[PDB]
């Protein structure tokens, strides 16, 4: 832990650097849809200033959606129970 500052600045930075991973992939899979509302989900929050606490909290920032906003809780939640090494 070199950085950490408790000034002005983001307080997720996790679920963001994450969606984007992950639309990564896709883009590699050949999915030009998935990708496009992917990063485009991932726009909303390049913008959102506070954190996240809700799936509704987060649907209503424009760029997203419903499916998207369960989505990122569904990140949030490790995947299902407890959390695995790829």
């Given at each position: ?60 920032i424009?760029?997203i ?22």
């Amino acid at each position: 832990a070199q950085p950490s500052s408790q000034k002005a600045t983001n307080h997720n930075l996790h679920i963001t650097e994450k969606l984007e991973v992950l639309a990564k992939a896709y883009s590699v899979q050949g999915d030009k849809w998935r990708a496009l509302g992917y990063a485009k989900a991932i726009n909303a929050l390049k913008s959102f200033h506070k954190p996240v606490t809700s799936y509704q909290e987060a649907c209503s920032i424009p760029g997203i959606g419903k499916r998207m906003a369960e989505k990122i809780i569904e990140i949030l939640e490790s995947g299902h129970l407890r959390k695995l090494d790829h």
